[PDB]
Amino acid sequence: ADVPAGVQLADKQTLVRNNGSEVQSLDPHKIEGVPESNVSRDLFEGLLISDVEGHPSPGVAEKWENKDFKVWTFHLRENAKWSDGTPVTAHDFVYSWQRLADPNTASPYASYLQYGHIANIDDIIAGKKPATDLGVKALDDHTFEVTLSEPVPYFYKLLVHPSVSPVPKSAVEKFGDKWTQPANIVTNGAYKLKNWVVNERIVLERNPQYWDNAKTVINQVTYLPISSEVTDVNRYRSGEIDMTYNNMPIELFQKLKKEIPNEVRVDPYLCTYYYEINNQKAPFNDVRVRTALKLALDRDIIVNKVKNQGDLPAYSYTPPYTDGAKLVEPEWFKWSQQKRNEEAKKLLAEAGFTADKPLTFDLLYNTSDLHKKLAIAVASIWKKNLGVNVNLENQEWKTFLDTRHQGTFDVARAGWCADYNEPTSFLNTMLSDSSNNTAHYKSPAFDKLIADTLKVADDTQRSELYAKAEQQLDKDSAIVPVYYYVNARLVKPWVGGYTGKDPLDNIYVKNLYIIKH
Numbered sequence: 106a107d108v109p110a111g112v113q114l115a116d117k118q119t120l121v122r123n124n125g126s127e128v129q130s131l132d133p134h135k136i137e138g139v140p141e142s143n144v145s146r147d148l149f150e151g152l153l154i155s156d157v158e159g160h161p162s163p164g165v166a167e168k169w170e171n172k173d174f175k176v177w178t179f180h181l182r183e184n185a186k187w188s189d190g191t192p193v194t195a196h197d198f199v200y201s202w203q204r205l206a207d208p209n210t211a212s213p214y215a216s217y218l219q220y221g222h223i224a225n226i227d228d229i230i231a232g233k234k235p236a237t238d239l240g241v242k243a244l245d246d247h248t249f250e251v252t253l254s255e256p257v258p259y260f261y262k263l264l265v266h267p268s269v270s271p272v273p274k275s276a277v278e279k280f281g282d283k284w285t286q287p288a289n290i291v292t293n294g295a296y297k298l299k300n301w302v303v304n305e306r307i308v309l310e311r312n313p314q315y316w317d318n319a320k321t322v323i324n325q326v327t328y329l330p331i332s333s334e335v336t337d338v339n340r341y342r343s344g345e346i347d348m349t350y351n352n353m354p355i356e357l358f359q360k361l362k363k364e365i366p367n368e369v370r371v372d373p374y375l376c377t378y379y380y381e382i383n384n385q386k387a388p389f390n391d392v393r394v395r396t397a398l399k400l401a402l403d404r405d406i407i408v409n410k411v412k413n414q415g416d417l418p419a420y421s422y423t424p425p426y427t428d429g430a431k432l433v434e435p436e437w438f439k440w441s442q443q444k445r446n447e448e449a450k451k452l453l454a455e456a457g458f459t460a461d462k463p464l465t466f467d468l469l470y471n472t473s474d475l476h477k478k479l480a481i482a483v484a485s486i487w488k489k490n491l492g493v494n495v496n497l498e499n500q501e502w503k504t505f506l507d508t509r510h511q512g513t514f515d516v517a518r519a520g521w522c523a524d525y526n527e528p529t530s531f532l533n534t535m536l537s538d539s540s541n542n543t544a545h546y547k548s549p550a551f552d553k554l555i556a557d558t559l560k561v562a563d564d565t566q567r568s569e570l571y572a573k574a575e576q577q578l579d580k581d582s583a584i585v586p587v588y589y590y591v592n593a594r595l596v597k598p599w600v601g602g603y604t605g606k607d608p609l610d611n612i613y614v615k616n617l618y619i620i621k622h
């Protein structure tokens with residue numbers, strides 16, 4: 106943390122953050138969500154990290170070079186250590202990226218190495234070559250070299266993500282799936298794991314072996330798993346929570362802006378809220394049905410009337426303000442809702458649905474006051490506008506993600522936030538073979554458009570291809586875009602270091618500090 110001249114620090118440097126839900130895991134290769142990544146950034150540190158404003162910056166690698174954007178060489182700082190005192194080396198990264206790639210690990214983020222185009226990853230994911238053929242090597246203990254199959258000028262931006270953080274081989278190998286328990290885990294970030302009580306709390310304590318430990322200020326941070334946004338706000342206002350999770354309750358938000366304006370942080374956020382359609386399950390394999398659902402949803406009611414927190418009506422998957430996005434707003438988005446409603450009704454009537462044999466399906470969401478309120482509103486809008494019936498179903502976070510991967514669903518509430526600020530951080534998840542493709546969308550036309558983006562060495566041609574890829578996605582109505590998020594959360598006045606400037610919201614508790622109060 107960089108504490109400004111003249112700020113008086115509190116004697117007690119502890120922080121309590123709400124984290125939305127119980128994490129899927131603390132293993133960097135088994136996680137895919139925001140709550141998981143929130144904890145992962147304090148415990149495991151990769152090659153690069155985001156600074157306090159979100160720019161990719163030195164992490165374990167103090168400096169790096171690239172040859173033709175294909176061969177990337179990372180110079181690892183000599184004093185990088187794990188919490189047990191042992192050095193962090195390039196061998197740790199070699200083992201770790203191989204483990205990520207290995208199909209036996211079944212990482213939801215195995216395809217992150219396809220997004221970076223690391224040599225031989227397609228063959229490794231497919232079981233054709235062993236994980237040891239991945240194009241990574243330790244040239245020495247402090248030098249990690251990555252070889253890509255084609256030039257990727259933005260490759261280094263990918264490297265702040267938890268899936269490419271190192272994991273300690275000896276603990277993994279010795280304890281298997283219990284390696285992340287507090288008695289066994291070993292970490293290389295600014296913190297170490299102290300306590301982990303499922304559905305209660307995660308408590309982290311400063312890691313004195315962290316190379317940048319002298320600049321860490323917070324000695325202990327607790328992450329809570331509260332999925333009720335009302336409850337989070339309540340325990341924030343009671344004094345227990347210093348930073349809410351960034352999901353705000355419809356019940357209280359308007360009141361909060363008038364009651365504690367200075368605590369209500371609202372900043373840009375590269376995330377999209379949408380209804381994910383299971384594209385492989387009838388009748389959702391019919392484009393007429395998917396298009397009907399997309400068009401009948403009334404974003405103006407949802408965004409400005411029911412939620413009204415500053416979100417923007419969405420017409421794409423990639424947020425339009427992503428670095429490199431130059432998207433074309435489709436003509437349907439400019440129509441009246443009435444006109445969208447008629448076309449929708451028309452498509453379902455065309456698809457064989459009637460008042461007597463209507464369209465009935467489930468709407469799955471992760472337990473939340475916000476998602477439940479939005480799902481009820483969407484259910485009523487779809488009922489009223491299109492005559493479709495929906496059965497709402499909530500599931501806890503971890504189970505919810507597994508259901509989507511399983512494909513044991515119809516429609517699910519969903520949100521995707523960028524892992525790196527470039528359109529492919531969204532678009533790559535809709536590739537036929539992506540491990541993150543829970544829409545189960547498979548389009549050769551879409552796959553080809555994205556494959557072509559690294560076959561040109563021109564930024565405008567690349568941006569035109571992303572725009573066309575979004576148009577392919579939209580034409581197929583793979584999903585139902587709802588709104589682009591704003592990052593809205595409450596932060597006590599004594600919490601220093603949170604700028605709100607990072608559109609990815611990659612917070613590190615090592616950058617924060619408690620002001621005397």
Ligand SMILES: [U]
Nearest residue numbers: 114115116117
């Ligand atoms: U004190």
Ligand SMILES: [U]
Nearest residue numbers: 257258259564
């Ligand atoms: U650049």
Ligand SMILES: [U]
Nearest residue numbers: 427428429526
């Ligand atoms: U940029």
Ligand SMILES: [U]
Nearest residue numbers: 466467514515
């Ligand atoms: U269903």
Ligand SMILES: [U]
Nearest residue numbers: 335354356474
């Ligand atoms: U509620």
Ligand SMILES: [U]
Nearest residue numbers: 258562563564
């Ligand atoms: U460039």
Ligand SMILES: [U]
Nearest residue numbers: 115620621622
């Ligand atoms: U105080």
Ligand SMILES: [U]
Nearest residue numbers: 115116117622
């Ligand atoms: U105090």
